[PDB]
Amino acid sequence: RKLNMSILINFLDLLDILIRSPGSIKREEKLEDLKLLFVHVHHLINEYRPHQARETLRVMMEVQKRQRLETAERFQKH
């Protein structure tokens, strides 16, 4: 998140520079380097990290069954 904020700030600074000094022709080349960062962005913010935590939740899944077993304990109370 800090890197994304820094990238947004750097994009604003580059836009201000292009508005103030438009003679830069290599800036677009940096976008190609962003492709490398895009690799990391392939796991950036949306829908891939929580699955890892789901691993731990897997154990909790059986705990959910234990919760059902808790209800089954009522049968013993019967």
């Binding site: 913010i45 949306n46 829908e47 929580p50 699955h51 935590a53 789901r54 731990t56 939740l57 154990v59 909790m60």
Partner: protein
């Protein structure tokens, strides 16, 4: 970023709300020392679970906050962790979508 209008602004706002999402006290959960990789090099046991579920540790369940903000592993408590005045029934701490 070239052509923007009211419909474009509404679409951008909806996309941002879909992708990223009076007290509103944000519980700044700090990196807990009881983990598995660079934590205590130990497996998941009852101690780590009880420390992350009862104490303010975002190890497995989540670091609980004040004002009865109970943030367990699957606790969808109606807290105010967002930056708005809507203390609705938020999703679980894991929020596995």
């Amino acid at each position: 970023l070239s052509r923007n209008e009211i419909i474009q602004s509404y679409l951008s706002r909806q996309s941002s709300l879909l992708s990223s999402s009076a007290r509103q006290p944000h519980v700044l959960l700090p990196l807990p020392t009881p983990t598995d990789l660079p934590g205590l090099t130990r497996e998941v046991t009852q101690d780590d679970l009880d420390r992350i579920q009862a104490q303010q540790w975002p190890g497995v369940n989540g670091c609980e906050d004040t004002q009865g903000n109970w943030y367990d592993w699957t606790q969808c408590i109606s807290l105010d962790p967002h930056g708005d005045d809507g203390r609705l029934n938020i999703l679980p701490y894991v929020c596995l979508d």
